[PDB]
Amino acid sequence: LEVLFQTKLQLFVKASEDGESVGHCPSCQRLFMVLLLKGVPFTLTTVDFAPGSQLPILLYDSDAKTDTLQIEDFLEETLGPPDFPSLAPRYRESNTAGNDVFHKFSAFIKNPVPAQDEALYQQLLRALARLDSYLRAPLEHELAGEPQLRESRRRFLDGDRLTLADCSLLPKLHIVDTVCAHFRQAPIPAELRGVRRYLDSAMQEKEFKYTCPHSAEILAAYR
């Protein structure tokens, strides 16, 4: 399928198995979000170049960019104020909080070794706890207003608006919760209030909600 939002910009992404929606792929969803959050017109084309290239790919004019980070930087650079909002996070830590969660999930979820399962699980939980800490800690602009504040009020990594950091992390975190809950009866623990609210908040945000693959597609990818 194809989706026209409102050309110059064309993002190629994986299609779902039945071909009717977008397929599972957190980097695809990441750039899908970035483009929506820019509010720039664009075409999304699902699919069911250069050696070992993989989706997502962005066509601009006739130019092709095939690497996710490259694509992202390009969009943040060439689509700027006043016509489009900058999506760079304000705070360095927004860019690193949660950065090991997804790779510790994969190590855990793929693990063939019974004796290492609990261990790999605790490593995943520990990274989630660190993300949770950052999410609960008042940011600079928050302390400006309330120097008393002990617990952050904000919705997302860097504040109350989605940034590039959220576009990267949310699709990955969504996968973690979705797979762990269905396959291991292990949703992200309720004790991690910051992480849970963050996921709840993202779901109420149209750019995230409507870029998510159907859960069935995520599940199929993990068996």
Instruction: Report which DSSP code applies to 20.
Output: S
Expt. technique: X-ray
| Distance, CA of 168 to CA of 43 (rounded, Å) | 20
Number of H helices, E strands in the chain: 10, 5
CATH number of the structural domain 89-223: 1.20.1050.10
Architecture label for domain 1-88:
3-Layer(aba) Sandwich (3.40)
| Distance, CA of 173 to CA of 128 (rounded, Å) | 9
| Strands lying side by side in the sheet with 57-60 | 2-5, 42-47, 9-14, 57-60, 63-65
Surface-to-core class of residue 86, CB atoms within 10 Å of its CB (0-12 exposed, 13-18 middle, 19+ buried):
middle
| Total count of residues recorded for the chain | 223
SS3 5: strand
CATH 1.20.1050.10 location in the chain? 89-223
CATH 3.40.30.10 location in the chain? 1-88
Overall resolution, Å: 2.0
Neighbours of 77 (CB within 10 A): 10
